[PDB]
Structure 1
Amino acid sequence: DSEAVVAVDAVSFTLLQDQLQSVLDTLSEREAGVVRLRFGLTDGQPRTLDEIGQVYGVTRERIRQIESKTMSKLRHPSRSQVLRDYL
């Protein structure tokens, strides 16, 4: 049964999202919320920059700068190593 749950990948994914939330909590709460709403983590809806601005009271360009900060500070190899192994 292809659709049957392998029961290992699901558990792995549970710890995987645990690792994700732990890593993102290292980042600033504002940046954490930005990326969460950016890729649809709390919900299933990734959101456009204007939604992030209207929920943060900021312009879309500043959210672009925030995204730059997020994925730059994310490339810092301490995060890179602890998230790379999980694949």
Structure 2
Amino acid sequence: KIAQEPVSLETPIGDEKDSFYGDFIPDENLPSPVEAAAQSLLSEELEKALSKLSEREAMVLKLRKGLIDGREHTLEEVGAYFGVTRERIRQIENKALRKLKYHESRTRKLRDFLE
């Protein structure tokens, strides 16, 4: 398998002289418009769906998913952020997600994005 070398992208395909093999290759290294709009809808709907939660748990939630600084903060950090223990934050998440569960099982706005 490793023996065989690559393939010239200039290899003409079909019985014509106007065709190439290069152009027949798509692009996955760049977002599609539908994908930008998709990630936008998730980033939005999740925001408004976030608003309906306790002030502390709304924050702690996006601190554990890395929605704030892009990095994820372990329980040890969150507890030091508010001043609670690493046990309290843990429970806070449990009641958090499960609290949005109820609103989502209804509104069904975010029931999508299930691939």
- TM-score higher than 0.5 here? yes
Residue 82 (1) aligns with residue 109 (2) = yes
- Residue in structure 2 matching 1:13, options 36, 39, 42: 39
User: Where do 5+ consecutive residues of structure 1 fail to align?
Assistant: none
Aligned twin of 1:41: 67
Q: Looking at CA atoms only, which structure, 1 or 2, has the larger radius of gyration?
A: 2
- Residue in structure 2 matching 1:63, options 89, 99, 102: 89
User: Where do 5+ consecutive residues of structure 2 fail to align?
Assistant: 1-26
Bigger Cα displacement from structure 2, 67-76 vs 51-60: 67-76
> Runs of at least 4 residues of structure 1 off by over 6 A?
none
The superposition leaves residues 20-40 of structure 1 with CA deviations (integer Å, 9 ceiling, x where unpaired) of 010011111211101100010
Count matched residues.
86
TM-score normalised by the chain length of structure 2: 0.69
For 1:11 and 1:44, locate their aligned partners in 2 and report how far apart those are by CA, in whole Å. 20
Structure with more helix by fraction: 1
Which AA in structure 2 matches 1:9?
A: E
**How far off its partner does 1:71 sit?**
1.8
The superposition leaves residues 45-87 of structure 1 with CA deviations (integer Å, 9 ceiling, x where unpaired) of 11110100111010011111101110221221x3232211344
Greater relative contact order (CA < 8 Å, ≥ 6 in sequence): 1
For 2:76 and 2:30, locate their aligned partners in 1 and report how far apart those are by CA, in whole Å. 40
Give the percent of matched residue pairs that are identical in Structure 1 and Structure 2.
Answer: 50
